[PDB]
């Protein structure tokens, strides 16, 4: 829901502690004199050498940082004065296939890759509706990309007829990754 | 520039031929009585069993289709009456690093992956400007993700100072793929 | 444990059925006159047009094949006379990190990719022993490939001292994928 | 041919320099008193804090290291006394398809991934022989995994007949990545 990082006045997560859920242009404001240890529970975050998000940068990933050298590659400075969460830009291609019409029953989500066999994913229900959130996909009736093919583009298919299936049957899907125009 | 597919009245790319650069809701219009062979030079395209982009679907990828069974998995019908190019939705994470300021000199493009060493890619120039088109990246001064770190988010950095580098030096980059908020 | 495929005399998995757990150079031997439908539960398998694993080839992946055209792209022939499982050659790079010495306690397996943060995988125990089954890896004390580095090559490390850690602490790992010699 | 790394007595690649093409259990032997800068041209290499490949570890990737802090994350010690190249264990799945029999003419190498269209790779010759070095692959006559299928396992196919092709025609290939036994 929120990013979450905890700063400690002392190493080893010792001393006065302070939780942040958003940017802090001036950490002195949290009462902790000079961060000594940091604990990141929901990130990532970028911390700065100076206030206002200026000077040397340090990116913090989920995990434990028990001392300043754990985060300053340069080992330039031990100063940590500003923090902010990072909104990561990370684009996947995703399609969700559902057992029943209208996006109900068992579901199967596929992120970016091709799947030559749904039963090998434990999916063995029929496919009555599909939601394509991104990417260009091709669904096939049988495993190994065989039988009738259905082009699946961004959009909602509430029923199998909408994608052209004569029966709510899909057993493989592949993503179209290239265009030569 | 345009998609390009050529339909032949006969198998083996024989007979009256017709080039399409866009959708054809009714192939009879091209003079070719019943497509016998198809050649795709810039795709992909989706063809349909009936006019107006109705009935069984067939997706065509760059390559040669010398006969109807080469494209109809069902082998249901041999009918090909409508065609249209497919606009593929395919999202990459890309960053371009340039030798000189302002996006000039030698360049290096990185698509989605991490690169622990620029010299192993043949890139050994300094890095003075960066263009991030998508993704969240972290640039480092030395190979193996060492030294000063620079967070690189969508945007243009005309000079190294804009990304916080004290010198136009970058030798590794990694992409931030997850957020826990 | 064994591959498993079931052949039916009739379409739709109807009629006399027969389970195979190994190669059948002559399917007539199973009593089913001409396979009509096939069900693959543990594969893949390769089937042949003629006996003895001769003629047209058809590869079967986990899933349901309710009729012959579901498996013969050519749609050449409807004949299925020999079957054999395929031993797939599929090489991964794998490392397992364990909470306690000697390969005990909680464990974390990593297949081929880099992991910048163990806590983001739900792993937050210390790392006392490592098993590297394949690949060249580099373990680091903190997230984001920071702190002491430990080169991890094929082999068993029963205790953290064997990999050179001063403490059973590892929070990131990356695989070395290239050599320039 | 050999790994190659050059050690300099001074920072910025200054001073007495020494090239290594193999392990050096005691760098004092090269005349350079305390490495100040390192240049890696063919690696990777692992360096050690003490002689004989003991103490803190530092992995060196192709690139420039102008000062000691460029390589010691700990920033523990500035000592570099032993070096050795790393033999990387890195397993790919590779298949090479050739225009003419016997592994001659134009060639196309495929490493690990599926290729739905050879013409989209610029390959438009026929395929008369195949070398599979690793992996389990399936070759198809037309693009998009259509037409006759040929199972391609580790081994040499000097002519198209050996893989069962009736014509030296292959336009797509996919790798079989899973086995359920």
Swiss-Prot record, chains A, B, C, D:
Region (Connecting peptide): 88-92
Protein's name according to its UniProt entry: Beta-crystallin B2
Family to which the UniProt record says this protein belongs: Belongs to the beta/gamma-crystallin family.
Chain positions carrying an annotated carbohydrate: 34, 54, 62, 87, 94, 106-107, 126, 154, 158
GO biological process, one term: lens development in camera-type eye
Recorded domain comment: Has a two-domain beta-structure, folded into four very similar Greek key motifs.
The keyword Repeat appears for this protein: yes
Keyword Glycoprotein on entry: yes
Record's keyword terms, sorted: Acetylation, Eye lens protein, Glycation, Glycoprotein, Repeat
Gene (UniProt): CRYBB2
Gene3D superfamilies referenced in this protein's UniProt entry, alphabetically: Crystallins
Source organism (scientific name): Bos taurus (Bovine)
Subunit note: Homo/heterodimer, or complexes of higher-order. The structure of beta-crystallin oligomers seems to be stabilized through interactions between the N-terminal arms.
Top-level taxonomic group: Eukaryota
Disulfide bond annotation, renumbered to this chain: none
InterPro entries hit by this protein: Beta/Gamma-Crystallin, Beta/gamma_crystallin, G_crystallin-like
Domain Beta/gamma crystallin 'Greek key': 3-42, 43-87, 93-134, 135-177
Site, Not glycated: residue positions: 4, 28
């Amino acid at each position: 829901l929120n990013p979450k990082i905890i700063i400690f006045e002392q190493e080893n997560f010792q001393g006065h502690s302070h939780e942040l859920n958003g940017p802090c242009p001036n950490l002195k404001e949290t009462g902790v004199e000079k961060a000594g240890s940091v604990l990141v529970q929901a990130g990532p975050w970028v911390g700065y050498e100076q206030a206002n998000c200026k000077g040397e940068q340090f990116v913090f990933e989920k995990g434990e940082y028990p001392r300043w050298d754990s985060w300053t590659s340069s080992r330039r400075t031990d100063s940590l004065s500003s923090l902010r969460p990072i909104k990561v830009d990370s684009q996947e291609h995703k399609i969700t296939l559902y057992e029943n019409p209208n996006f109900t029953g068992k579901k199967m989500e596929v992120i970016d890759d091709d799947v030559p066999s749904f039963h090998a994913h434990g999916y063995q229900e029929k496919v009555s509706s599909v939601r394509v959130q991104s990417g260009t996909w091709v669904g096939y009736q049988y495993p190994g990309y065989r039988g009738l093919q259905y082009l699946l583009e961004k959009g909602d298919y509430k029923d199998s007829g909408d994608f052209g299936a004569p029966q709510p049957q899909v057993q493989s899907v592949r993503r179209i990754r290239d265009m030569q125009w």
